[PDB]
Design a protein around this ligand. Structure first.
Ligand SMILES: Cc1ncc(C[n+]2c([C@@H](O)CCC(=O)O)sc(CCOP(=O)(O)OP(=O)(O)O)c2C)c(N)n1
Ligand SMILES: Cc1ncc(C[n+]2c([C@@H](O)CCC(=O)O)sc(CCOP(=O)(O)OP(=O)(O)O)c2C)c(N)n1
Ligand SMILES: [Mn+2]
Ligand SMILES: [Mn+2]
Lengths: 556, 556
């Protein structure tokens, strides 16, 4: 009888199904057409609910929650451009593996392509970027609940990584009293409603087999490259490489402790690349390598075999080496391919790395973004986590700092967009409840400015450092043409962030020197709130300091 | 030989080709992969260049420019999530007709699906939303320039309406001095380079034939419904309806002068629906009707025939009436189907319309958003234009005000997104150079907050009224459930906009009464800058006032 009531019962099956696959967090944006999903979610006690008004920011909030928690995170939006705004976060999830379940409300079929308000063609609108796409039919009791739950269960159960687009059409009426319409339809699932398992259990595991010739290859001269992995995996990789006697090139994203720090500098020295030419195998664990010199060495090296171990699917070597692409949990993979103690084979590179770090330390005093990057270890919150933005900051920390082994680092380095960094950081914080240091550039902060609304709600202190060098100064590091550089690349916006902080009642500091910065941090970690720290630096100093250190270390 | 030089020669052909199709404005976001396109655009004197750091805002800026100028507008962005952020504006263009030419830089094929930084699958990523999609090949001199320009000319020449996605892969190196690589390849186009015409002229016109039985139908009892159309078309439709003696129901977007104003109120009166039951034909010109009562009457009416005349393609009647869907320029269509002088047949509705407007006038004094909407016709800038936002404001003006015939009104009412209203308003202002009044809600202003950066640059005064009723109070108008309403629908953010204005050095006023509002207006119109006027109102007053007026008029 009641369409409004059946809509809600149809939606309740969808939401309850998700709880059987570890969905705990659900992020919801406002709308009318999404009513059946949103009310089902609100009524379901299994969920932690997050809200936001900008669906692009909502998608990145969900991304951050998923990134840290390692469980699927659901999103509810209404029909129309609300759905399109989820694209950036979905694309990033497709590259780095976050499980985002996008529940996108839709008009019913009879209201598509007829000029109806807020009605667009939604099935397939994210093309190949979701791992799975479900285009649900117009709700009807003539399709059994067991079909609906089974379709959800197949999508979630078989999900190795990445997003799922579930398009959910609903016809009006959407509002009205809840009657018994659809109760017997639901009850056909019997005591599944009281169960904690999926209706259909379909959970194949995707994993490469052990490499049986590892105990041959581990005897050879090898290099370990560590990219993005978990904080615990970083510690395990550091011990493993040390035991192998192989040099470990550790990315800022690796949490290995970077025992040969400043690789972006010393990989520029001919003595280093000459010694690495002796490598017969490279075993890379993790991916999304940060530094230019590392990417260039990776592209140029010619070991007999190149292996990449990661739980991400697909090719991960942009230089297309002869070798192996091994899909595995990194910690599990290390157990299956253990190290045996062996004399180290590198003799020159440890010296060069020490010399490289000494060159950076010699330049630590100037109050600039290169020095902030170098020193950032001194400002990490205890038992906290770091969220590192894109553009210069991730490159500077990677090149100039040595981050502690096992200290959690998070980032958006799949597609490396500057469009969702504040909202992602908010999700990273909420997921773990840890004190968080997030560092972003000024254009990045402007891009996601309204995410400061989300940052009014954190469970532990969050410090947002905005490095304001007046534009995208990565384009002062790149050899962009001088005539067009300011207008068409740097795009200085000539703003500060004190009023932004004030709008959202966030504490704000603009430290002028190292002492003021240390005071600002000591202030900030005291309460479970977000503090904005704006570091104003001269436009090109960071880029130029990196360039100078590169040159200096190359001549060592 | 030089890859960087040839990249730029390939791009130069693309950009110069666009000048032969009326492209004057180009909107550019920052990046490296986009270098060939951006430098080709920058060097070409034919263009006016606009920049912005948020690609979602950039798309909407281009939308606003296209909306007013009625010419194609180009957009350049770099690869990755930058491209995804264009989706909302592209979808809106697809619905309302703006010609947006999206030049999306891409990695070359050898860097896709291999874990390379900022590389994603871009061809087809907008699915069916572009009118035309071009996936350009990896640049090479082995494909002649005549092919490249012909492909562009086909897409632009045959473009009736909506967006074009042109995906543009470029391999590194991207930077370097320009040499003669690709010069002889370009010169194969000969004096096309000096021409004002396309290489291939392909421009078939899409248009419905003259209706041969119009002289029969124009003598019947007809109703004219006017939706979105140009300001000049609105004046012509008003005269045409008046001549025929047919009642004209005119949308806020119609610029007809709304001779039977407050239709959203008087269509709720049974006597008006009874009189309209006598209508034998409904001729609707334009689409995207605003008001609920009008959409309800449209859905219930059963004239012998229902016609919709508009220059947008496809079905435009969400009630699927028996009738005709006629594709034409509305002005041309009226000339082809002229009015005959006939006696008006409606008697009751003119009475009701006057009584309805009197009911609204009686409540004009309170300092609320309903009253602002009613009185907005008194505050329109001389020789200016109005940009109306979504949610309550467009509904309140449509229901409560009578806007002058021929006074330009602009909006985003295809998909009615609240995600790009500020950036669109900026483009609307820049394209015409006219003084502009823009009115939006608080969640809408927060959504596109960083577009205040764009509003620092307007060519005539722009008044941005932000109506702050603390949340999306359209959900206090809709029968949303009270228990979940605040957290999951209204989502109050409890902010003001004084600091937002200050951040971007915009003048700001928060008037407490009508005198202060009028003082703010008078001052704002004196300089070619943006003034932010925040009207703080009681949350539910606007929605309740509309409900009350609906009830009162229904009982007349
Ligand atoms: C959504 C989107 N659209 C455009 C871009 C292009 N893009 C970049 C990629 O080239 C770099 C990706 C990376 O880190 O690898 S970096 C950059 C400027 C950032 O300026 P900033 O925050 O002030 O930082 P600073 O440069 O240190 O001063 C841009 C605009 C993008 N990434 N994402
Ligand atoms: C991108 C996106 N995502 C979500 C929505 C859903 N949505 C709406 C559509 O349902 C109504 C469209 C219309 O027809 O006008 S209106 C609305 C609230 C806006 O709040 P406000 O600015 O403070 O204004 P007020 O309600 O008058 O107080 C939302 C959140 C959307 N439209 N677009
Ligand atoms: Mn910057
Ligand atoms: Mn509001």
């Amino acid at each position: 009888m009641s369409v409004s009531a059946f809509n809600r019962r149809w939606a309740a099956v969808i939401l309850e199904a998700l709880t059987r696959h570890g969905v705990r967090h659900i992020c919801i944006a406002p709308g009318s057409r999404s009513t059946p999903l949103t009310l089902a979610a609100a009524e379901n006690s299994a969920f932690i609910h997050h809200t936001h008004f900008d669906e692009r920011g909502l998608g990145h909030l969900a991304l951050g929650l998923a990134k840290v928690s390692k469980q699927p995170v659901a999103v509810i939006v209404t029909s129309g451009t609300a759905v399109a705004n989820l694209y950036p976060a979905l694309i990033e999830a497709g590259l780095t593996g976050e499980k985002l379940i996008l529940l996108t409300a839709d008009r019913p079929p009879e209201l598509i392509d007829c000029g109806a308000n807020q009605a667009i063609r939604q099935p397939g609108m994210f093309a190949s970027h979701p791992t799975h796409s479900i285009s649900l039919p117009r709700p009807t009791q003539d399709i059994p609940a067991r079909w609906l739950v089974s379709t959800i269960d197949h999508a979630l159960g078989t999900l190795h990584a990445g997003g799922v687009h579930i398009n959910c059409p609903f016809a009006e009426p959407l509002y009205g009293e809840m009657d018994d319409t659809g109760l017997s339809w639901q009850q056909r699932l019997g005591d599944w409603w009281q169960d904690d398992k999926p209706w259909l259990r379909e959970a194949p595991r995707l994993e490469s087999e052990k490499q049986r010739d590892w105990f041959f290859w581990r005897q050879k001269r090898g290099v370990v490259v560590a990219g993005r992995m978990s904080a615990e995996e970083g510690k395990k990789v550091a011990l493993w490489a040390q035991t192998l006697g192989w040099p470990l090139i550790g990315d800022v994203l690796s949490q290995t402790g970077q025992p040969l720090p400043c690789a972006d500098l010393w990989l520029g020295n001919a003595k280093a690349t000459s010694e690495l030419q002796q490598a017969q195998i490279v075993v890379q664990l993790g991916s999304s390598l940060t530094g230019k010199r590392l990417l260039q060495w990776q592209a140029s090296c010619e070991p007999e075999e190149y292996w990449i171990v990661d739980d991400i699917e697909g090719r991960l070597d942009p230089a297309h080496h002869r070798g192996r692409r091994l899909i595995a949990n990194i910690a599990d993979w290390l157990e299956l391919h253990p190290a045996e103690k062996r004399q180290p084979w590198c003799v020159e590179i440890p010296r060069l790395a020490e010399q490289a770090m000494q060159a950076v330390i010699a330049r630590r005093d100037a109050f600039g973004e290169a020095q902030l990057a170098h020193r950032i270890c001194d400002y990490l919150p205890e038992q906290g986590q770091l969220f590192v933005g894109n553009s210069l900051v991730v490159r500077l920390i990677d090149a100039l700092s040595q981050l502690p082994a096992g200290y959690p680092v998070y980032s958006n380095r799949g597609a490396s967009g500057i469009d969702g960094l504040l909202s992602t950081a908010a999700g990273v914080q909420r997921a773990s409840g840890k004190p968080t240091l997030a560092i972003v550039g000024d254009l990045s902060a402007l891009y996601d400015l309204n995410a400061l609304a989300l940052l009014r709600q954190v469970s532990a202190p969050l410090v947002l450092i905005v490095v304001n060098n007046n534009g995208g100064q990565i384009f002062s590091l790149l050899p962009t043409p001088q005539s067009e550089r300011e207008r068409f690349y740097l795009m200085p916006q000539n703003v500060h962030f004190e009023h932004a902080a004030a709008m959202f009642e966030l504490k704000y500091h603009r430290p002028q020197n190292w002492q003021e910065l240390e005071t600002a941090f000591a202030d900030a970690w005291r309460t479970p709130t977000t503090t904005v720290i704006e570091m104003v630096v001269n436009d090109t100093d960071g880029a130029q300091t990196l360039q100078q250190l590169l040159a200096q270390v190359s001549h060592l």
